[PDB]
Amino acid sequence: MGPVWRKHYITYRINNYTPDMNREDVDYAIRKAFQVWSNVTPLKFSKINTGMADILVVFARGAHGDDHAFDGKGGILAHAFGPGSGIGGDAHFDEDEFWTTHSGGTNLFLTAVHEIGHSLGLGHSSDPKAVMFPTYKYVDINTFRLSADDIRGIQSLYG
Ligand SMILES: [Ca+2]
Ligand SMILES: [Ca+2]
Ligand SMILES: [Ca+2]
Ligand SMILES: [Zn+2]
Ligand SMILES: [Zn+2]
C-alpha cells in the first residue's frame, strides 16, 4: 500500500457521460459512491466542472489512451489508478458495458464504489463480502454496506 492522498479535500470531475443512463443518475451514482468512503474517513469530495481534478471519471471503450485497453462487453468492467499526479486517481468505466441504476446491466454505483477504493489507494480483498473483492457481484440498495474489511482497509490508509 504505497500511495495515498496527503490532503483531506479531494476533487473529482466527470469527463464525459455514458449514454446508457440519465445524466442526473450518473451524477448521483458517482456522488453516492464517493459518500461511501467519506463516511468512514476524514476525506471530503467535491465535484468540479472545469480545471484539473484529482480524480477524473471517464467512460471509454477499447484502447483509450492509457496502455490498459478495455475488452468489449463483459470481462473487465472498469479500472482505476492509485493516488498520484496526472492519471493517478483516475477511474475509467468500460462504455461497452451497459451501465444502470438497478440490477439490470452493470450497476454504476456499485462499480464506482469499488473503483474509488482503488483511487484512494486500496488493492483487492480476499473477502467475498468486501466491495474490494476482485469480482463484481450485484447487491441491491437494501443489502449494500461497506464490509468491516473494507473499513479496516481504508482506515489503515486514512484514519
Ligand atoms: Ca488524477
Ligand atoms: Ca468489458
Ligand atoms: Ca454503454
Ligand atoms: Zn483506462
Ligand atoms: Zn478492482
Author numbering: 105 to 263
What do the authors of the reporting publication say about this deposited model?
pmcA Disintegrin and Metalloproteinase 8 (ADAM8) is a transmembrane protein belonging to the metzincin superfamily of metalloproteases. ADAM8 is activated by autocatalysis in the trans-Golgi network and, for in vivo activity, requires the homophilic multimerization of at least two ADAM8 monomers on the cell membrane. In this context, the binding of a bifunctional ligand to the catalytic sites of an ADAM8 active homodimer on the tumor cell membrane could efficiently reduce ADAM8-mediated tumor growth and invasion to the surrounding tissues. In particular, we chose to dimerize the arylsulfonamido-based hydroxamic acid JG26,14 which has already been reported as a nanomolar ADAM17 inhibitor with a good selectivity over MMPs and ADAM10.
Considering the good fitting in ADAM8, JG26 was dimerized in the P1 position through the insertion of a N,N′-bis(carbamoyl-propyl)-isophthalamide spacer to give compound 1. X-ray crystallographic analysis in MMP-12 cd taken as model metalloprotease and molecular modeling studies in ADAM8 cd validated the design of 1, driving the synthesis of two other analogues bearing linkers of different lengths. Crystallographic analysis showed that the crystal of MMP-12 in complex with compound 1 belongs to space group C2 (cell parameters a = 51.291, b = 60.39, c = 54.00; β = 115.23°). The bifunctional inhibitor 1 (assigned occupancy 0.5) crosses the crystallographic two-fold axis of the MMP-12 homodimer, generating a trimeric adduct: MMP-12–1–MMP-12. In detail, the two hydroxamic acid groups of compound 1 chelate the two zinc ions of the MMP-12 homodimer, thus orienting the 3,5-dibromobiphenyl groups into the S1′ cavities. To verify if this arrangement could also be plausible for the ADAM8–1–ADAM8 trimer, we aligned two ADAM8–JG26 complexes on the MMP-12–1–MMP-12 adduct, maintaining the same N,N′-bis(carbamoyl-propyl)-isophthalamide spacer present in 1. The obtained complex was then subjected to 1.051 ms of MD simulation to analyze the stability of the trimeric complex. After ∼500 ns of MD simulation, the system reached a good stability, with the α-carbons of the two proteins showing an rmsd of ∼3.5 Å and the heavy atoms of compound 1 with an rmsd of ∼5.0 Å, thus confirming a good match between the experimental MMP-12–1–MMP-12 and the theoretical ADAM8–1–ADAM8 3D disposition.
